[PDB]
Design a binder for this molecule. Structure first.
Ligand SMILES: Nc1cc(NCc2ccc(F)cc2)cc(C(F)(F)F)n1
Ligand SMILES: Nc1cc(NCc2ccc(F)cc2)cc(C(F)(F)F)n1
Lengths: 202, 206
């Protein structure tokens, strides 16, 4: 009955708030997980037929889809603890362009201004697991969700560079692209109010 | 030592004052310049400007002599005359605004950041927010204004809000602090961030 997309930047607990509420208001609900780079691309395929998409990727004026914001989530710039930029007593973002970045997506296929790699030296990866596997190996630095790096930080396995730029992580809007048709449905509005309220708690 | 600072007209006054008190504490001399967010970044790009810090909502990465950080947040509303067509629609979307005229900031000539770029094809520009609301209240169109600038006109029913579906309670907008690269290695600048940020957080709670 309903098909929903959540990118891998949405913390898992939110994928839970979406499930419980939609299943309450609809008969059948389908869930798909994709990288934030592949989120908007997936819903644009005519054969996809995806009704809702919850992602951080920004892109205004999408056919058949309207946009709104559900809340926020945090993301950190991370690098191997012994990475050079960690040891730099003073941290800056202007300098990161000079080091290799482990980013998402592919070279072919445009990246939104949000996920576009900053560095000239870039190494792409399919998911967040592969990014950290290389970053922990000191290959480079990357931008990951809070929940995806919460443990590796607690255990000193990984460092943070974003504390000067935005302490406590870098707030990222969480957009909800909803098929324009759903706008006239009492069930959908009930989903937003609840989904947003639950998302605030974090 | 001497500091010259720019704050755009989207920064609420309590936000501006909170920044002022901290700069005067950590620096000897401080000067303030106020501009619309559309002209904020443009002003510091002029070499003759000689502006050391610029606090604005405008986005632009890779600025010469300037680095960027986040200082805090502020709220913004889409507003229109209460009897505006879109008001009668109990539920609004952003795809529909493109067909109505927008009262925006900036100039017609001169590139617009992706943030402040007007959304509608029919647009009418204004230099400051006062002129924007003057036209919006006259029903000429809709606009994007800071929370503090329209809080009064909303309480008095003089003006309506269209953004409650998009982002209830206002549209959170990051407030960046563009700082001359030189300040990065100055103990005064770091104390200013640490203090200004802490005070702005406590303030945001209130
Ligand atoms: N590329 C990217 C950007 C994100 N936020 C915007 C941002 C841009 C620059 C910066 F330094 C920090 C954050 C979040 C993620 C994700 F991994 F969390 F999904 N990735
Ligand atoms: N143009 C503009 C954009 C702002 N935020 C980005 C944004 C864009 C669309 C939207 F619906 C909500 C927010 C804030 C302001 C200001 F007046 F508050 F400064 N102006």
């Amino acid at each position: 009955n309903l098909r929903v997309l959540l990118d891998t930047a949405i913390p898992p607990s939110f994928c839970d708030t979406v499930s419980s509420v939609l299943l309450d208001d609809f008969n059948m609900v389908s869930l798909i997980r994709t990288s934030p780079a592949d989120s908007l691309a997936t819903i644009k395929q005519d054969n996809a037929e995806i009704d809702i998409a919850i992602t951080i990727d920004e892109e205004l004026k999408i056919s058949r889809f309207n946009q709104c914001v559900l809340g926020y989530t945090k993301a950190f710039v991370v690098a191997h603890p012994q990475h050079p930029l960690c040891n730099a007593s003073l941290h800056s973002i202007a300098s990161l362009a000079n080091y290799r970045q482990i980013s998402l997506g592919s070279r072919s296929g445009q990246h939104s201004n949000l996920l576009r790699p900053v560095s000239d030296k870039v190494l792409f990866v399919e998911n967040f697991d592969d990014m950290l596997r290389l970053v922990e190996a000191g290959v480079g630095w990357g931008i990951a969700p809070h929940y995806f790096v919460e443990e590796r930080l607690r255990n000193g396995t990984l460092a943070v560079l974003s504390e000067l730029y935005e302490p406590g992580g870098i707030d990222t809007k969480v957009y909800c692209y909803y098929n324009t048709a759903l706008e006239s449905e009492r069930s959908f509005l009930r989903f937003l109010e609840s989904a947003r309220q639950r998302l605030r708690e974090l």
